[PDB]
Design an enzyme around this catalytic site. Structure first.
Site, PDB file in Angstrom:
ATOM      1  N   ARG A 151       7.341  56.557  90.702  1.00 60.66           N
ATOM      2  CA  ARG A 151       8.236  57.229  89.914  1.00 60.66           C
ATOM      3  C   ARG A 151       7.752  59.189  90.251  1.00 60.66           C
ATOM      4  O   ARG A 151       8.897  59.479  90.626  1.00 60.66           O
ATOM      5  CB  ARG A 151       8.666  56.708  88.444  1.00 60.66           C
ATOM      6  CG  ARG A 151       9.719  55.342  89.004  1.00 60.66           C
ATOM      7  N   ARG A 172       0.199  51.627 100.747  1.00 58.31           N
ATOM      8  CA  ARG A 172      -0.145  50.361 101.650  1.00 58.31           C
ATOM      9  C   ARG A 172       1.323  50.002 103.096  1.00 58.31           C
ATOM     10  O   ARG A 172       1.269  49.556 103.729  1.00 58.31           O
ATOM     11  CB  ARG A 172      -0.586  49.900 100.804  1.00 58.31           C
ATOM     12  CG  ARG A 172      -2.163  49.439 100.757  1.00 58.31           C
ATOM     13  CD  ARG A 172      -2.511  48.988  99.205  1.00 58.31           C
ATOM     14  NE  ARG A 172      -1.946  49.114  98.486  1.00 58.31           N
ATOM     15  CZ  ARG A 172      -1.655  47.991  97.198  1.00 58.31           C
ATOM     16  NH1 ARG A 172      -2.127  46.937  97.130  1.00 58.31           N
ATOM     17  NH2 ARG A 172      -1.373  48.142  95.775  1.00 58.31           N
ATOM     18  N   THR A 173       2.534  49.847 101.880  1.00 66.07           N
ATOM     19  CA  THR A 173       3.698  49.138 102.460  1.00 66.07           C
ATOM     20  C   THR A 173       4.337  50.155 101.845  1.00 66.07           C
ATOM     21  O   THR A 173       4.641  50.773 101.819  1.00 66.07           O
ATOM     22  CB  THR A 173       3.716  47.837 101.552  1.00 66.07           C
ATOM     23  OG1 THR A 173       2.699  46.607 101.179  1.00 66.07           O
ATOM     24  CG2 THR A 173       5.294  47.301 101.699  1.00 66.07           C
ATOM     25  N   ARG A 227      -6.459  60.639  90.436  1.00 58.52           N
ATOM     26  CA  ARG A 227      -7.855  60.300  90.127  1.00 58.52           C
ATOM     27  C   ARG A 227      -8.557  61.478  90.985  1.00 58.52           C
ATOM     28  O   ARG A 227      -9.073  61.814  91.846  1.00 58.52           O
ATOM     29  CB  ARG A 227      -7.724  58.806  90.575  1.00 58.52           C
ATOM     30  N   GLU A 256     -14.905  64.376  84.105  1.00 60.98           N
ATOM     31  CA  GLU A 256     -14.182  65.099  82.328  1.00 60.98           C
ATOM     32  C   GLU A 256     -14.612  64.778  81.211  1.00 60.98           C
ATOM     33  O   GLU A 256     -14.723  63.980  80.808  1.00 60.98           O
ATOM     34  CB  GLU A 256     -12.304  65.014  82.094  1.00 60.98           C
ATOM     35  CG  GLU A 256     -11.406  65.408  83.895  1.00 60.98           C
ATOM     36  CD  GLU A 256      -9.974  64.877  83.516  1.00 60.98           C
ATOM     37  OE1 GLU A 256      -9.321  64.930  84.465  1.00 60.98           O
ATOM     38  OE2 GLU A 256      -9.758  64.396  82.822  1.00 60.98           O
ATOM     39  N   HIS A 274      -6.340  68.545  82.644  1.00 62.29           N
ATOM     40  CA  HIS A 274      -5.275  67.289  83.059  1.00 62.29           C
ATOM     41  C   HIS A 274      -4.665  68.025  82.214  1.00 62.29           C
ATOM     42  O   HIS A 274      -4.379  67.097  80.616  1.00 62.29           O
ATOM     43  CB  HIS A 274      -7.016  66.484  81.953  1.00 62.29           C
ATOM     44  CG  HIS A 274      -5.497  65.360  82.646  1.00 62.29           C
ATOM     45  ND1 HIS A 274      -6.819  64.243  82.235  1.00 62.29           N
ATOM     46  CD2 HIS A 274      -4.774  64.681  82.799  1.00 62.29           C
ATOM     47  CE1 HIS A 274      -5.723  63.046  82.561  1.00 62.29           C
ATOM     48  NE2 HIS A 274      -4.894  63.294  82.914  1.00 62.29           N
ATOM     49  N   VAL A 275      -3.464  68.767  81.885  1.00 60.42           N
ATOM     50  CA  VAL A 275      -2.778  69.243  81.813  1.00 60.42           C
ATOM     51  C   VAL A 275      -1.057  68.581  82.206  1.00 60.42           C
ATOM     52  O   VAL A 275      -0.195  69.277  81.662  1.00 60.42           O
ATOM     53  CB  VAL A 275      -2.441  70.703  81.432  1.00 60.42           C
ATOM     54  CG1 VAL A 275      -3.508  71.244  80.278  1.00 60.42           C
ATOM     55  CG2 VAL A 275      -2.008  71.399  82.822  1.00 60.42           C
TER      56      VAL A 275
END
Lengths: 316, 317
Positions: A151, A172-173, A227, A256, A274-275
């Protein structure tokens, strides 16, 4: 009685404000099994932001539910929770548009150097030195490759289309009825695009490696909002230093809140702590969804946003 | 080879490409006092920024002023028009870039991304923990465009994809547009929480964004200025920010650039940029090319590419 909900460590105050609607709250200063006292044997649920160590999770025989604050739940051992029949909920959808906004922001900041330009003005340099240097990069003429979709990926793509940029993706798909160019290989996508946005909502450990970066090319820009561990840090640093890629924007890191010192030195790198979802309104909605998951579980036996690995219903 | 005067600083790309067709004459600043007798034969000017009337009028053979930038306030167009001097600018090639900057400024104003970056770089993530949550967000916001034009449309187009409603205020409405028109600025400001000042047209908007427009915008109100510094009543903005009458502002333009009022530098909820709207290498190169291409087109075909509305002229030899 009111189920007892453990909140280990820091959490948004809004979670704490709303838990007393249905629950008794138990706080420990950090997410550490050593803080657990005997009188916490009756804990039925956990609300947590960040790491939930397995020893803490497994210290509670009556634990039914872990309500994770955040769409990502890497800090919860979901396999182990699933194995013990513990439902795990996260916070999707209520942060989707916010995260997508931050990603576009990071990208514009990486390309156009807006924070540096602002710093230049604030330091008095506009007057004495003249115009901020022209940004070597721009969004104009760029092609974007989404590593991962979901999403959030769709939301990012939707925004990028309005900027007149082509969108490719690698998953992957493939996805039916989309109209973005699918790529079965990451490296192949990287060859075809100049802008790689890492979303990765399966293992992608060090997937963005020296070869993916090399493929991305000398006008190549890497944006990481997924990530930290997905990007090979040493390979990124080398590629930035050698001009193998042109720039990078990073909102996530491997350890972090520590950020590798080498990444701080580059003039063509934008770094955020990481906002992604860190507005008051979005963190309140996330706080509400954590609490509402718990309330829904304990009142109706059905959670609102259980993770894919735990499609459970309450037995008592 | 026509002689083209380039007064003061200009993008090096302009200077690289002028020798395709022209002889170049440089003066260190846009100042009539630098003009020597041997410059009598100047036929054209390429200029970025202010072109003082005494410099413009020092050249009896002057046919064309090629302005670097879509805005040409630094050229006295009425005087050029009166002397039959064509004036060209650089529209279109910067539209998408400017719109990108405006969205950037807006996201930075709302989400405090430059401060968050500063917080990380200062070592505060480790020592103090997370950057504070941004009090504002784009979520649930309504945007009002003060002025429209190709740049306004481009901004609106981007904002629609962020799921925000768009209103606009212009003198005359536009047919077949999906946006809510407002015949008054103050009325638009009442209806929206985010006011983006673009004001591309002819008409005067001097101090239009005043204390009352800001008051109407309200305590969740955000002001973004990417149009004209003079359109915003500076004193009223400062008072409104200090009293919490509005919630924040993002400014890319100022009344007396490159000077920025000291009071505006003190606010934690204000994002400030040194007029970087179009300031990428690729967009400034395209602008450079259009300056030169205007000159080449004029002197080779007698027709400019992007003459300004006030001078729809053709060359007489």
């Amino acid at each position: 009685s009111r189920p007892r909900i453990l909140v280990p460590g820091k959490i948004n105050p809004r979670v704490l404000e709303r838990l007393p609607e249905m629950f008794e709250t138990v706080r420990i200063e950090r997410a550490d099994a050593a803080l657990v006292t005997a009188d916490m044997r009756d804990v039925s649920g956990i609300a947590v932001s960040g790491k939930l160590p397995v020893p803490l999770m497994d210290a509670f025989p009556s634990l039914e539910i872990v309500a994770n604050f955040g769409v990502g739940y890497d800090g919860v051992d979901v396999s182990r929770a699933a194995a013990r029949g513990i439902v795990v909920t996260n916070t999707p959808d209520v942060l989707t548009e916010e995260v997508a906004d931050t990603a576009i922001g990071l990208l514009l900041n990486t390309l156009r150097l807006l924070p540096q330009a602002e710093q230049w003005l604030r330091q008095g340099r506009w007057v004495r030195e003249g115009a901020f240097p022209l940004s070597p990069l721009s969004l104009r003429g760029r092609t974007v490759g989404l590593f991962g979709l979901g999403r959030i990926g769709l939301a990012i793509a939707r925004r990028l289309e309005a900027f007149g940029v082509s969108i490719a993706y690698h998953t992957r798909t493939p996805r039916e009825g989309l109209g973005f160019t699918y790529h079965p290989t990451l490296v192949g996508m990287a060859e075809a695009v100049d802008t790689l946005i890492v979303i990765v909502p399966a293992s992608t450990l060090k997937a963005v490696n020296a070869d993916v970066l090399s493929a991305l090319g000398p006008k190549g820009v890497l944006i990481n909002v997924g990530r930290g561990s997905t990007v090979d840090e040493a390979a990124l640093v080398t590629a930035l230093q050698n001009g193998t890629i042109a720039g990078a924007g990073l909102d996530v890191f491997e350890n972090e809140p520590n950020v590798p010192e080498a990444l701080l030195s580059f003039p063509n790198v934008s770094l955020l702590p990481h906002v992604a979802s860190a507005s008051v309104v979005t963190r309140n909605a996330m706080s509400d969804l954590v609490v509402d998951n718990l309330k829904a579980w304990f009142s109706t036996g059905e959670a609102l946003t259980p993770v894919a690995e735990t499609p459970f219903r309450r037995r008592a």
